[PDB]
């Protein structure tokens, strides 16, 4: 059996658990052996992971970068070892990559902002909880959101990273709340940060603030259904993982593939 490796940025996020499951299901279907390694949001750990795999008989590397710019060295190592690289969800700024599979994050950010404008109104006072700086995903969602900002004349009270993490999201929101009690809406660049922000609002007795997340994870969708989260932009993590293994199969089979494969987004609201 050929071995495909999946190096994921972290497993402490339901989104990446789903991405891993999607890849696992497809590997099983296509008869591949899937090795999963966790970089734990650490570029140093990611590099060590890739160095390790290059001598394990790995046929293809599926990588979800911890950082789009820092991952370059790891990609170049796979390149030297003649192991084809396919990036999933986040881009690699440097190094040779055969294919990239991800959502349109610029569109996602604009769509989230447009929905805020539709509910809280034009000129609304907003806070943005950004993802990990250095990732294409955070960068693109910010750009998209900025389009909605200019379009809807939003007043951005504060924008700050909470690293796609639920606990950091809670703490950052708690601190921002004390300095900006007049916030009307929050765009959280992923559901984990959105759920943390909701807990901060809960602790603070602020039920009047509209929160929009991103991912459509099981927890994210439940909160929308329970009326706590106003909306989330659903991605298809499982399909990103499956598409990665499928593309890996073609490459190994000598079939040529597209350099970029888009996966659809969907706005999710209650009802
Ligand atoms: O697209 C993914 C998901 O939003 C995840 O929750 C954080 O990392 C991003 O790159």
From Swiss-Prot:
It is found in: Periplasm. Part of the ABC transporter complex RbsABC involved in ribose import. Binds ribose. Also serves as the primary chemoreceptor for chemotaxis. CDD domains: PBP1_ribose_binding. Its main location: periplasm. One of its GO terms (biological process) is D-ribose transmembrane transport. The gene is rbsB. GO terms for molecular function: monosaccharide binding. The complex is composed of an ATP-binding protein (RbsA), two transmembrane proteins (RbsC) and a solute-binding protein (RbsB). This is Ribose import binding protein RbsB. The keyword Transferase does not apply. The keyword Cell wall biogenesis/degradation does not apply. Keywords: Chemotaxis, Periplasm, Signal, Sugar transport, Transport. One of its GO terms (cellular component) is ATP-binding cassette (ABC) transporter complex, substrate-binding subunit-containing. Belongs to the bacterial solute-binding protein 2 family. Pfam families: Peripla_BP_4 (PF13407).
């Amino acid at each position: 059996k050929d071995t495909i490796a999946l190096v994921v940025s972290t497993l402490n996020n339901p989104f990446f658990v789903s991405l891993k499951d999607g890849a696992q299901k497809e590997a099983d279907k296509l008869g591949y052996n899937l090795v999963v390694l966790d970089s734990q949001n650490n570029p140093a750990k990611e590099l060590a992971n890739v160095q390790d795999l290059t001598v394990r008989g790995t046929k293809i590397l599926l990588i979800n970068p911890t950082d789009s710019d820092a991952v370059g060295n790891a990609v170049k190592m796979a390149n030297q070892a003649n192991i084809p690289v396919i990036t999933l969800d986040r881009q690699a700024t440097k190094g040779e990559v055969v294919s990239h599979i991800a959502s349109d994050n610029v569109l996602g950010g604009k769509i989230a902002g447009d929905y805020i404008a539709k509910k809280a109104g034009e000129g609304a006072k907003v806070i943005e909880l950004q993802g990990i700086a250095g990732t294409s995903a955070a960068r693109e969602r910010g750009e998209g959101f900025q389009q909605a900002v200019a379009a809807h004349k939003f007043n951005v009270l504060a924008s700050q990273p909470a690293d796609f993490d639920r606990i950091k999201g809670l703490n950052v929101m708690q601190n921002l709340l004390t300095a900006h009690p007049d916030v009307q809406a929050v765009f959280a660049q992923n559901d984990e940060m959105a759920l943390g922000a909701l807990r901060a609002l809960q602790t603070a007795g602020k039920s009047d603030v509209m929160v929009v997340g991103f991912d459509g994870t099981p927890d994210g969708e439940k909160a929308v259904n329970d009326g706590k989260l106003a909306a989330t932009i659903a991605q298809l993590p499982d399909q990103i993982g499956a598409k990665g293994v499928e593309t890996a199969d073609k490459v190994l089979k000598g079939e040529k593939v597209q350099a970029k494969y888009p996966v659809d987004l969907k706005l999710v609201v209650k009802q």
